[PDB]
Design a protein around this nucleic acid. Structure first.
Lengths: 64, 206, 98, 150, 100, 79
RNA sequence: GCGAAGAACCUUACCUGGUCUUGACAUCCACGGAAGUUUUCAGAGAUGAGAAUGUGCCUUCGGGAACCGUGAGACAGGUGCUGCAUGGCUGUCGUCAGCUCGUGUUGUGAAAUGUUGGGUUAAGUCCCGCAACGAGCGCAACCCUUAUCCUUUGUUGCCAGCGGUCCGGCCGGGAACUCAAAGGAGACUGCCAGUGAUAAACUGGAGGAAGGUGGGGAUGACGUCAAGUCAUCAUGGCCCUUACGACCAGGGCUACACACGUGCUACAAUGGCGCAUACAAAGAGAAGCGACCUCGCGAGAGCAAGCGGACCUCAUAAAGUGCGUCGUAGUCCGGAUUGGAGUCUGCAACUCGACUCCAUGAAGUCGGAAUCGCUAGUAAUCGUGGAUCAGAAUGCCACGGUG
RNA sequence: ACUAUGGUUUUUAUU
């Protein structure tokens, strides 16, 4: 593995494992699907509105 | 009421710029300052020569200008050689030798600038102000298009209020981002006022 | 060897220029590879875009500089002379290098 | 109002397999570092066997089965007016409320070593005296004289 | 903004052209931590203490279409209250609003 | 220990002293530069210095010499 | 904390005292001079007077023009007054679901009807139905963009496959997870169950990288607030035009005997410190960023490569992980104030600049009635970078780690 | 078991 932080590398490795492990025996192909491990997780930006301070906080607002 | 520039909000859909050249990050502010003043100075030199739109280019340490007109013969002028004094001074406010190109407008009363001088020249010649637009619309839909809006402000009473008149034909369209329109704003300065005019022409999506 | 620094501010203008210079090279018999696209370089800012105060009106803008090199590896001269005086789509800049 | 929300039950501790120890290190988490808290709690038994702690089966259970919170205080509106009313503690904070009452009592104490302040606070819960156990009793004694509203 | 503020700065840049232009490192032949306490380079200092109307300060970039000092964007020569107009009027290459 | 081993000075005020010692009962010698240093041979003279709205008189003493002129005169109001 | 994000001369709206106003900016006419470069002297200085340096361009060889420095006549110019006069330029109720018209009907008539009603939606959206039947603007749809696979082109990035093996992607070479790029597919309530006028429509499930206004950009129907701004412009009116013009030597805008917000950091020992120890990401930078090397404890000053973007510089990522040690003392913690000695840009470092090191080190017990804000990668916590920028903010716009 | 006190002026009718 190369690039990213070790918790991001765990996100790459955990699906790189199942792309091989589902060929390892026919009796694993349903079982990894029954657990949700054969698909990319649904996380993606999620990047701030123009302009919020940092993810949220409309900078010095608190209005009304 | 909320509004935005109707050509500048559509410019992000595959269109080029009318100021179309390259410059380095330190010379860009100077190459832009010369682009603005050649467009100003040249459209003023040709202010009675039936001009519509301009495009600026830069050949190797030169400047290139194309001007669109409905009378090319009076811009190229005497013997077809009367152009040197028309590149002479744009070269002196650009700091580089200038090159001329002239382009003919071939459906003139369907161009957003030349139709605005056409209705300016009817408001000048004292037509009915709240009905002037119907002639320009008839003459434009004779040349092509899918829809047209030309809007007049001032002298529309009765009372002298913020009233505007244009009349509905086809689509404006108020939106459609890929609408591929032709747009201009003009002032007639007739009838003791400013007499503000705006025009939108629709020919079909992209 | 020669490289040609073809630069633009738009991602289609540089493809429509590549479709002129690489076709001129192939039709003039030049031995050429697939030209590299290079990592895009950017300039960006976020500023108060209202005419007088109104402090909420802060908005983001960005502009992108695209560059290609074309890269000719072969020492042949007649095959590439057709590129050096060639006209390309308006608004691109060219400079010749090693 | 609307919602009806999704909720989290958190990962167990990576040494003991305990989700109760995981919630304890989350309430012991300051400055977001989280590994620091593992080195403060359950990182010694020799400091509990220094005071009242008797055998390892009670080295953490003195904060779990040793107590049962039921109510919280403050005021609530009924009709046109507000009254002081004891409210029913929710069944999953039930086992994780006393964690704050122990972590706060150790964190705010002026007595140096934090790993030892926590083992000493667990020893003072193993005797059933003062801190955390009276914060349970005070509100129950209040609710034994306040019954008309819920 | 009085129109003299730029009309004087262009004359000061033309004067820096004999004192600082390709001469701002010229101090590197007279600067020393001690020099044995001798004097041999005062031929430079006679001319570095001569100007008063030219200096490494007293300059404001402004906008090339308004004398206003603040709200400026150096690489365009324009303001934060002029580029959004120019980028919709089609008066500047490379820059556009929305799409993207 | 002043800023650089060489002091920044101009003799434009020192050049007036041999005439300001014969002024009689006329109003004192007036100056506008306040960053100027006061040399020891300027002692025993009255000078008029800008306070920010008028000029006020100061007499040169053994406390004023070797320092700047503006260090011995007021610069602000409400007094 | 908004613009006013950079107040020593400056910038800059103005005052003391000077000095000059066809003026900062443009030509017509007039005179001695090329444009320009230096030096001597008086004055606070601006500036003024001498003496040299050069003789460009055009030359019906007639003498002339840019231009310099000045003087006329046309003229300049205004943080001079003004967003209920007008353009421009920007906001908000409001991407809200609002708003009406023809025919037909009704009521003496203005005017109503449809548009109300039923089930619903992101929604005057969609289906159902009656004295209403149809149409259009806004909406829907359509647009830019994102998670995923297949296919292809590749560098001084990457090294899979296949060779060499200064044993190093360093090379032959290549397009393999990647990375940098492009092209083609992909999503429709369509498919299946439960619900409901098997109408409309909803919640889940199957597929799939993933939906159900997916998420992010982005348009503004009649009607609102006479919304905001002449201190950013155009232009009419009112005013000035030797002045409110604006250049010098001082300087103002960090006022102040006086009331109040909002934000930062400690009080420590899940702390402070040193050594050992691991991962960045995105930016910026050619009279630039400035490596290795040197002098000094140091600010910093020299020597002298690399780099224009993936073989460099700014720049050992820090909080963290490991280990020893101090231990309520109002403390090596933690901070105001201060003596001495130095480092730096600049007419200039009084009033009125930044940075470093010895010498001295006050407070500070985690805060009381009361009041303020945050709902998941949200709170909190630590580090990187840049713009403005001679030299000087803690403010500000971005990029990552821990959670 | 509920708060006295913030006056006053505005538009589309023509072809």
């Amino acid at each position: 593995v190369k690039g990213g932080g070790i918790s991001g590398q765990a996100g790459a490795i955990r699906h790189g494992i199942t792309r091989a492990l589902m060929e390892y025996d026919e009796s694993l192909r349903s079982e990894l699907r029954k657990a949700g491990f054969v698909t990319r997780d649904a996380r993606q930006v999620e990047r701030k509105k123009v302009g919020l301070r940092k993810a949220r906080r409309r900078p010095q607002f608190s209005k009304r | 009421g909320q509004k935005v520039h109707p050509n500048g909000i559509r410019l992000g859909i595959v269109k080029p710029w009318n100021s179309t050249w390259f410059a380095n990050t330190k010379e860009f502010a100077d190459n832009l300052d010369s682009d603005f003043k050649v467009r100003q100075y040249l459209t003023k030199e040709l202010a009675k020569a039936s001009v519509s739109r301009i495009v600026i280019e830069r050949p190797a340490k030169s400047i290139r200008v194309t001007i669109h007109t409905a009378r090319p013969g009076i811009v190229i002028g005497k013997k077809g050689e009367d152009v040197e004094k028309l590149r002479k001074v744009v070269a002196d406010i650009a700091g580089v030798p200038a090159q001329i190109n002239i382009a003919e407008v071939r459906k003139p009363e369907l161009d957003a600038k030349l139709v605005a001088d056409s209705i300016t020249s009817q408001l000048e010649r004292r037509v009915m102000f709240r009905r002037a637009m119907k002639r320009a619309v008839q003459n434009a839909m004779r040349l092509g298009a899918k829809g047209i809006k030309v809007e007049v402000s001032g002298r529309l009473g009765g009372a002298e209020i913020a009233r505007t008149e244009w009349y509905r034909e086809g689509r404006v369209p108020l939106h459609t981002l890929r609408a591929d329109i032709d747009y201009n704003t003009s002032e007639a300065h007739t009838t003791y006022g400013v007499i503000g005019v705006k025009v939108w022409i629709f020919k079909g999506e992209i | 060897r020669i490289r040609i620094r073809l630069k633009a501010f738009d991602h289609r203008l540089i493809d429509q220029a590549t479709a002129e210079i690489v076709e001129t090279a192939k039709r003039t018999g030049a031995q050429v590879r697939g030209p590299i696209p290079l990592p895009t370089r950017k300039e960006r800012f976020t500023v108060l875009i209202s005419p007088h105060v109104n402090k909420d009106a802060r908005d983001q803008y960005e502009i992108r500089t695209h560059l290609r090199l074309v890269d000719i590896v072969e020492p042949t001269e007649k095959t590439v002379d057709a590129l050096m005086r060639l006209d390309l789509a308006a608004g691109v800049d060219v400079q010749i290098s090693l | 109002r609307r919602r009806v929300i999704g909720q989290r039950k958190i990962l167990p501790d990576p040494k003991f397999g305990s989700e109760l120890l995981a919630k304890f290190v989350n309430i012991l988490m300051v400055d977001g570092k989280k590994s620091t808290a593992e080195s403060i709690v359950y990182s010694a038994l020799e400091t509990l066997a220094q005071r009242s702690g008797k055998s390892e089966l009670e080295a953490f259970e003195v904060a779990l089965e040793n107590v049962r919170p039921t109510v919280e205080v403050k005021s609530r509106r009924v009709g046109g007016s507000t009254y002081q009313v004891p409210v029913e503690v929710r069944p999953v904070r039930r086992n994780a409320l006393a964690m704050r009452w122990i972590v706060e009592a150790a964190r705010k104490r002026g007595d140096k070593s934090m790993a030892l302040r926590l083992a000493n606070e667990l020893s003072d819960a193993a005797e059933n005296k003062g801190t955390a156990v009276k914060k349970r009793e005070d509100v129950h004694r209040m609710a034994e004289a306040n019954k008309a509203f819920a | 903004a009085k129109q003299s503020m730029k009309a004087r700065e262009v004359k000061r840049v033309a004067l820096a052209d004999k004192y600082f232009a390709k001469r701002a490192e010229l101090k590197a032949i007279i600067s020393d931590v001690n020099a044995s306490d001798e004097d041999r380079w005062n031929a430079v200092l006679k001319l570095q203490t001569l100007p008063r109307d030219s200096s490494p300060s007293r300059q404001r970039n402004r906008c090339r279409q308004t004398g206003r000092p603040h709200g400026f964007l150096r690489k365009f020569g324009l303001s934060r209250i002029k580029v959004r107009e120019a980028a919709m009027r089609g008066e500047i290459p490379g820059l556009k609003k929305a799409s993207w | 220990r002043s800023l650089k081993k060489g002091p920044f000075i101009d003799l434009h005020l020192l050049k007036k002293v041999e005439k300001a010692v014969e002024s009689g009962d006329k109003k004192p010698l007036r100056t506008w530069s306040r960053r100027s240093t006061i040399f020891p041979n300027m002692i025993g003279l009255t000078i008029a210095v800008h306070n920010g709205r008028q000029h006020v008189p100061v007499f040169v003493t053994d406390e004023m010499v070797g320092h700047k002129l503006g260090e011995f005169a007021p610069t602000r109001t409400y007094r």
